Amino acid sequence: EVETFAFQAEIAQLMSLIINTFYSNKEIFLRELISNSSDALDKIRYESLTDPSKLDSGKELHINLIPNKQDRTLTIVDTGIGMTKADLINNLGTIAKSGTKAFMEALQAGADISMIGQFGVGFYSAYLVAEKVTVITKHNDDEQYAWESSAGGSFTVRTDTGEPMGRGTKVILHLKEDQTEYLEERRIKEIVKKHSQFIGYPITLFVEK
């Protein structure tokens, strides 16, 4: 049972901008996604202070970066608060309509695409490097869902079964054929060190066979 949804016109327009604009500094997508994980981890961290049972779905708060050269995927996984189905449908928990407007206004006032995170829509920077993005998420007391989109105006949502996560979000980037540098260990390490070096949770870069 796969449900198909239309992006709001403003989000479709943001995605088309990200896909079509000539913009060489694509590596900022990873900072944006790690920032989103850090925010999600802060949320579960705060909820747990008054309700420790919120960590029954896993106490460890951290981020994993998993490259897979066979599948041409880079996956960013966190054990943050996760998203409900309604959050996924509502622009993955973002204020993307107003954020898109602000980002567009900023761009005409001298901003560039690397400032996208300032407008709360950094997730969509994934489309600088990915042809398809799959988001698997599990929030306490909701079921596990998979969102997916290859842009083009629409996204799908379905329940995800097998490979349960205890809690959090996994962003699976199916990379564009010419963006495979982002599976190389030395390149990912460089980007994490350049742009994510003060994130307050462990970031483990997985090794490949």
Annotated binding site for ATP: 36, 78, 97, 123
Check if the beta carbon of residue 134 is closer than 8 Å to that of residue 2. Answer: no
d(CA 55, CA 83): 15
| Cβ proximity to Cl ion, 98 vs 154, nearer residue | 98
Check if the beta carbon of residue 180 is closer than 8 Å to that of residue 131. Answer: no
Please report whether residue 101 would count as binding Cl ion according to CB under 5 A. Answer: no
Binding region: 36, 78, 97, 123
CA-to-CA dists, residue 80 to 42, 116, 163, angstroms: 7, 22, 17
Tokens 């329940």 belong to which residue? 159
Please report whether residue 158 would count as binding Cl ion according to CB under 5 A. Answer: no
Please report whether residue 97 would count as binding Cl ion according to CB under 5 A. Answer: yes
| Cβ proximity to Cl ion, 12 vs 199, nearer residue | 12
CB of 21 to Cl ion, least distance (A): 22
Q: How many residues bind Cl ion (CB under 5 A)?
A: 3
Please report whether residue 176 would count as binding Cl ion according to CB under 5 A. Answer: no
Check if the beta carbon of residue 174 is closer than 8 Å to that of residue 130. Answer: yes
Please report whether residue 98 would count as binding Cl ion according to CB under 5 A. Answer: yes
| Cβ proximity to Cl ion, 119 vs 201, nearer residue | 119
Please report whether residue 95 would count as binding Cl ion according to CB under 5 A. Answer: yes
Check if the beta carbon of residue 189 is closer than 8 Å to that of residue 181. Answer: no
Residues that bind Cl ion (CB under 5 A): 95, 97-98
